Ligand binder design. Structure first.
Ligand SMILES: c1ccc2[nH]ccc2c1
Ligand code: NA
Ligand code: NA
Ligand code: NA
Length: 163
């Protein structure tokens, strides 16, 4: 297990444009295309991202390429964020994957709402953090995925992603 296998479980893999849990056009392994309701706007984003006229379909290789870019960009965003970097750097590698998972799903702007959780994680109060993390729109809207990410922060193991 690692961040790539973890997000591949959580996000799936679809080679045609679909709508994510929030209703937004998406492709591949959870690559958000746009928040616009325009399918044409999404297809345009996809063509820009892949570098060819795709007609709304990509290959597995192309999906994995976008995914690798997306994970990298997520982590580099964390390391440029004065609020997030110190918490990330405080964590072990397993918990760092859980942090990237959150940013991948909700963005830095979503994670901005979790200041009190992030403090508890920096303090290594794992059970308290887990409770605070679940008091969220995130948990209520995607509970099974949030439970897996939260278990990862709580335990510092991959137990939620085995089987
Ligand atoms: C950096 C980014 C996202 C995060 N979620 C929990 C801790 C943490 C640190
Ligand atoms: Na992808
Ligand atoms: Na992706
Ligand atoms: Na886990």
């Amino acid at each position: 297990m690692n961040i790539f296998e973890m997000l591949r479980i959580d996000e799936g893999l679809r080679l045609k444009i679909y709508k994510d849990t929030e209703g937004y056009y998406t492709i591949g392994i959870g690559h958000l295309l746009t928040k616009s309701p325009s399918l044409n706007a999404a297809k345009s984003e996809l063509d820009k991202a892949i570098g060819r006229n795709c007609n709304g379909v990509i290959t597995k290789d192309e999906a994995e390429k976008l995914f690798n870019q997306d994970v990298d960009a997520a982590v580099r965003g964390i390391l440029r964020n004065a609020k997030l970097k110190p918490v990330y750097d405080s964590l072990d590698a397993v918990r760092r994957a859980a942090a990237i998972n959150m940013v991948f799903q909700m963005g830095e702007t979503g994670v901005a709402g979790f200041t009190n959780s992030l403090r508890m994680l920096q303090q290594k109060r794992w059970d308290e953090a887990a409770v605070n993390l679940a008091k969220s729109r995130w948990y209520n809207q995607t509970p099974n995925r949030a439970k897996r990410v939260i278990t990862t922060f709580r335990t510092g193991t991959w137990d939620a992603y085995n089987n």
